[PDB]
């Protein structure tokens, strides 16, 4: 809206409460929209026994289709926005200025991938609370979208030129952030639940985990086929939760033609590290907090009293 | 496909309990649910309640809630019934019955309400 | 409640006719709809389910057929094995609360 004019601010896209606030908002909208016909949640608060919460509920076969979300200010306060393309996420931000609202926000639920998102202006950005740190994710921002379609039929196919390029730019960036003289390397999942060891999404209203193996096989900048990526998927019927530790359990799908195409926008990574006197990194798919799906599209603002 | 077996003839006082068991043998215990049917001498079919495996969750008839409950020990392939209070109208033939959901340990679960096995039946007399 | 009714109570056919069992729901039901037979002392034997669907192990002369609230169970052609007593059973609800009709015997005609 309005440029500050020599004004320099600080950011930190890790300690955001507008992060919080889209979070608590978020599994607010899937509680009265994606409901599951049996919702179970653990309850051990006590000395002995456990307690686990069941809910049955009717649970109808309903369209799920993210709509975006502008937040503007609170009550008492501003919003502030950094314009630098190649912010880091925590610091000094020298180009800042005021808006009445925040871009359009489609709150994707997702793992792995980060999908129908904001484009990086100029460069692909890789973003952490600590590089140095291997259990803390790492944000990849791309400047260019990736398609990704995805059929019911238990399939999505990705262009493999596309991807191939996409690593290579990201690989580039990874390695300007570890060591130029690094070999980079992707691998699958190292394991955890369904939910964050595969990609795992909502299309039609249903969930899918798809296998991403063939995205997350590459070595980069070591030594010197088909058109088409195609992961296998499976819909699931048993869902862990993402709001809060418990479990779901959905009807079966109802449509025999369940076809999206997304955009991937972004990565979640994190890297293997460990103690090793060897020049090579490797980086696997991950997420699962969805805290870091929202801080992918609201690392650049920032909410202050006026 | 899995085999149903289940307990012995029970005989019981109005104001009791019972516990009649299924043992299931000869697929994957998780991948199924399980449901038990009843049939008082001369009459139908009366369902009772279905217990999903994989998730440990039952769910009951209406007219039953509040005195019946199926639980199932997977370390023992082994479903149960209970039924409280006992009435000399609950004197029955009670069965164990099952069927398939797909790879619930993957997440599969079809949830049919249909029952493909079935066991040989436990009768259940209630008198005084 | 979901009421499952089946008719007639009784039907008698001649062995190797055909036979036509009816089950009406009180509410649509879809196609959650089985169908069951039983023998004297025996437990039911599941022959249709999703309401037009074969169980493994039925005779191709076993049929189910219709939607919603209206349902019949047709045997081609009567064998020894087929005279017994036939069940519905809806399982569209959810919570489940299921229920069966209360029987058709099927009994032969001489």
């Known amino acids: 809206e309005v440029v500050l004019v020599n004004v320099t601010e600080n950011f930190n896209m890790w300690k955001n409460d507008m992060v919080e606030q889209m979070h608590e908002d978020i599994i607010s909208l899937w509680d009265q929209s994606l409901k599951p016909c049996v919702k179970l949640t653990p309850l051990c608060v006590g000395a002995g026994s456990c307690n686990t919460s069941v809910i049955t509920q009717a649970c109808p076969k309903v369209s799920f289709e993210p709509i975006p979300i502008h937040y503007c200010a609170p009550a008492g306060f501003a919003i502030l926005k950094c314009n630098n393309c190649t912010f880091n996420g925590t610091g000094p931000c020298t180009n800042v200025s005021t808006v009445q609202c925040t871009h359009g926000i489609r709150p994707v639920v997702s793992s792995q991938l980060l999908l129908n998102g904001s484009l990086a202006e100029c460069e692909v950005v890789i973003r952490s609370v600590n590089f140095t740190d291997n259990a803390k994710t790492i944000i990849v921002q791309l400047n260019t979208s990736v398609e990704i379609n995805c059929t019911g039929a238990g399939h999505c196919n990705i262009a493999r030129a596309k991807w191939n390029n996409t690593l290579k730019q990201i690989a580039s960036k990874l390695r300007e952030q570890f060591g130029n003289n690094k070999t980079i390397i992707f691998k699958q999942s190292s394991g955890g639940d369904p939910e964050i060891v595969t990609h795992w999404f909502n299309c039609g209203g249903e969930f899918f985990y798809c296998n991403s193996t063939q995205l997350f096989n590459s070595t980069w900048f070591n030594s010197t086929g088909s058109d088409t990526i195609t992961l296998p998927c499976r819909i699931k019927q048993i869902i862990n939760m993402w709001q809060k530790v418990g479990k779901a359990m959905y009807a079966p799908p109802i449509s025999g033609q369940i076809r999206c195409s997304s955009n991937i926008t972004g990565l979640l990574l994190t890297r293997d590290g460990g103690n090793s006197n060897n020049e090579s990194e490797i980086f696997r798919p991950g997420g699962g907090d969805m805290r870091d799906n929202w801080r992918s599209e609201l690392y650049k603002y920032k909410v202050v009293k006026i | 496909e899995v085999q149903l077996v289940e307990s012995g003839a029970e005989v019981k006082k109005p104001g009791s309990s019972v516990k009649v068991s299924c043992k299931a043998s000869?697929?994957?215990?998780?991948?199924?649910?399980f449901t038990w049917v009843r049939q008082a001498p001369g009459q139908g079919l009366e369902w009772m309640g279905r217990?999903?495996?994989?998730?440990?969750?039952?769910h009951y008839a209406p007219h039953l809630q509040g005195r019946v409950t199926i639980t199932a020990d997977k370390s023992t392939s082994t479903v149960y019934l209970e039924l409280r209070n006992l009435r000399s109208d609950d004197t029955a033939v009670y069965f164990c019955?099952?069927?398939?959901?797909?790879?619930?340990?993957?997440?599969?679960?079809?949830?049919?309400?249909?029952?493909?096995?079935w066991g040989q039946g436990t009768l259940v007399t209630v008198s005084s | 409640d979901i009421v499952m009714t089946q008719s007639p109570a009784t039907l008698s056919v001649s062995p190797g006719e055909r036979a036509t069992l009816s089950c009406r729901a009180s509410?649509?039901?879809?196609?959650?709809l089985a169908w069951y037979q039983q023998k004297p002392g025996q437990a039911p034997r599941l022959l249709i389910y999703?309401?037009?669907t074969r169980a493994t192990g039925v005779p191709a002369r076993f049929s189910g057929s219709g939607s919603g609230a209206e349902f019949t169970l047709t045997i081609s052609s009567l064998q020894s094995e087929d005279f017994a007593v036939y069940y519905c059973?809806?399982?569209?609800?959810?919570?489940?609360?299921?229920?069966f009709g209360q029987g058709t015997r099927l009994e032969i005609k001489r």
């Open positions: 019955a099952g069927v398939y959901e797909g790879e619930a340990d993957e997440g599969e679960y079809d949830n049919n309400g249909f029952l493909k096995h």
């Open positions: 000869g697929d994957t215990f998780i991948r199924y649910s």
């Open positions: 217990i999903i495996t994989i998730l440990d969750v039952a």
């Open positions: 509410e649509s039901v879809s196609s959650d």
């Open positions: 999703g309401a037009s």
């Open positions: 059973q809806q399982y569209n609800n959810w919570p489940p609360r299921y229920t």
